[PDB]
Design a protein around this ligand. Structure first.
Ligand SMILES: O[C@@H]1[C@@H](O)[C@H](O[C@@H]2CO[C@@H](O[C@@H]3CO[C@@H](O[C@@H]4CO[C@@H](O[C@@H]5CO[C@@H](O[C@@H]6CO[C@@H](O)[C@H](O)[C@H]6O)[C@H](O)[C@H]5O)[C@H](O)[C@H]4O)[C@H](O)[C@H]3O)[C@H](O)[C@H]2O)OC[C@H]1O
Ligand SMILES: [Cl-]
Ligand SMILES: [Cl-]
Ligand SMILES: [Zn+2]
Ligand SMILES: [Zn+2]
Ligand SMILES: [Zn+2]
Ligand SMILES: [Zn+2]
Ligand SMILES: [Zn+2]
Ligand SMILES: [Zn+2]
Length: 371
């Protein structure tokens, strides 16, 4: 099956249009790249901002809201009939430092006095409510799907002990959802998003958290499974079990940030795209085959599958593509083998179904067919 230009390959979204939307994460510069634009128009019917809707991009100083970049994505989506997801109202990263300062400018996490700690909690929660309000009041009629909180459960299966949690305890999560619902109404859909959702003890900790929140009347419509995965991990069976366990709580499931890295963890990357052996693309294609068969099997539980980029020329996974060199300067990709140095974030991953030259990969063929 040939490596043809994607720009006129059969449309991915159309393949899946009765099963779930097909989405891409974008940067605003990509809406000014002719190829990226034609890719979005051709293959995708949902869109999300990779970065420009995060807390630090939207409100970098208190009272200073930049919606200009966010607005461009929204405008594009509307003109092209795409669904929109908002990523994300609350996170422990890419979040402005000002939220967590007390009235004297000291970090709130330092405060020892209990009455002052409680005052800081209430102040933080007010600021959270104001951030959410201002965003949802602007976008509630345009944006259907909302990542209300991102990564709030730890890999150890405890709540992530971020400043949100250290300052305000569990109530930051409830307040975020209640605020979104209050200002956005009943027709926006609210998600908790996280990675390694298939993995214990994180998975059951997420499940117990959400079950309790819903029992307490916190409005949560779904779970976002970030799905930053590898060729051989996590298994499809464990993916299935995960999706099924949340759908049994009455939750929608979205595959929100899918990419299938060529590498393991921590990754030992190739230094360039050209160095990645052909067999890796085949192994990837077979993984994508199995994965999409599974998502189809579960399509009544999955409303969207979004890729965390458009094509292999641009992926956040390059920032993790560490390149290991042996004493003779040769590249090392065997996870156990000797090496002398590492160049962090200097290599190349290849996670999508579309190549860096915008031509279709074997993974594309594997998911566009009906086998
Ligand atoms: O073998 C397993 C092993 O596999 C297992 O799991 C590891 C556990 O850790 C996982 O790592 C996670 C993956 O999820 C990450 O967060 C997601 C993804 O990234 C976010 O978007 C990116 C945010 O950063 C952006 O770059 C910014 C842009 O602006 C600049 O000004 C700024 O300076 C720059 O840094 C980038 O563009 C953007 O795409 C997304 O919002 C977020 O929600 C998380 O950070 C990371 O820790 C790993 O995936 C697993 O393999 O552990 C157990 C073993 O058994
Ligand atoms: Cl990126
Ligand atoms: Cl290529
Ligand atoms: Zn379309
Ligand atoms: Zn090259
Ligand atoms: Zn569906
Ligand atoms: Zn990017
Ligand atoms: Zn090519
Ligand atoms: Zn297939």
């Amino acid at each position: 099956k040939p490596h043809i230009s994607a720009l006129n390959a059969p449309q991915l979204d159309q393949r899946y249009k009765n099963e779930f939307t097909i989405g891409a994460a974008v940067e605003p510069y990509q809406l000014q790249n002719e190829k990226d634009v034609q890719m979005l128009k051709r293959h995708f019917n949902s869109i999300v901002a990779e970065n420009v809707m995060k807390p630090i991009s939207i409100q970098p100083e208190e009272g200073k809201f930049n919606f200009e970049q966010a607005d461009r994505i929204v405008k594009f989506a509307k003109a092209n009939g795409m669904d929109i997801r908002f990523h994300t109202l609350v996170w422990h990263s890419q979040v402005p430092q000002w939220f967590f300062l007390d009235k004297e400018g000291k970090p709130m996490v330092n405060e020892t006095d209990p009455v002052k700690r409680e005052q800081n909690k209430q102040l933080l929660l007010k600021r959270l409510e104001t951030h959410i309000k201002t965003i949802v009041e602007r976008y509630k009629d345009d944006i259907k799907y909302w990542d209300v909180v991102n990564q709030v459960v730890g890999d150890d299966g405890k709540l992530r002990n971020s400043p949100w949690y250290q300052i305000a305890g569990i109530d930051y999560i409830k307040v975020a959802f209640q605020a979104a619902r209050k200002y956005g109404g009943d027709n926006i859909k609210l998600y908790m998003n996280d990675y390694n959702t298939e993995v214990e003890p994180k998975r059951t900790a997420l499940y117990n958290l959400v079950k309790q929140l819903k029992e307490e009347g916190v409005p949560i419509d779904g779970i976002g499974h970030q799905s930053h995965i590898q060729i051989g991990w996590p298994s499809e069976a464990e993916i299935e079990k995960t999706i099924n366990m949340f759908a049994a709580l009455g939750l929608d499931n979205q595959i929100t940030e899918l990419d299938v890295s060529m590498y393991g963890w921590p990754p030992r990357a190739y230094p360039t795209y050209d160095a990645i052996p052909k067999q890796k693309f085949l192994d990837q294609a077979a993984r994508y085959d199995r994965l999409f068969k599974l998502y189809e099997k579960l399509s009544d539980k999955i409303s969207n599958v979004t890729f965390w980029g458009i094509a292999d020329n641009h992926t956040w996974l390059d920032s993790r593509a560490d390149v290991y060199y042996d004493a003779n300067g040769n590249v090392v990709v065997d996870p156990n083998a000797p090496y002398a140095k590492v160049e962090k974030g200097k290599g190349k991953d290849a996670p999508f179904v579309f190549g860096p030259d915008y031509k279709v990969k074997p993974a594309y063929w594997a998911i566009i067919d009906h086998k």
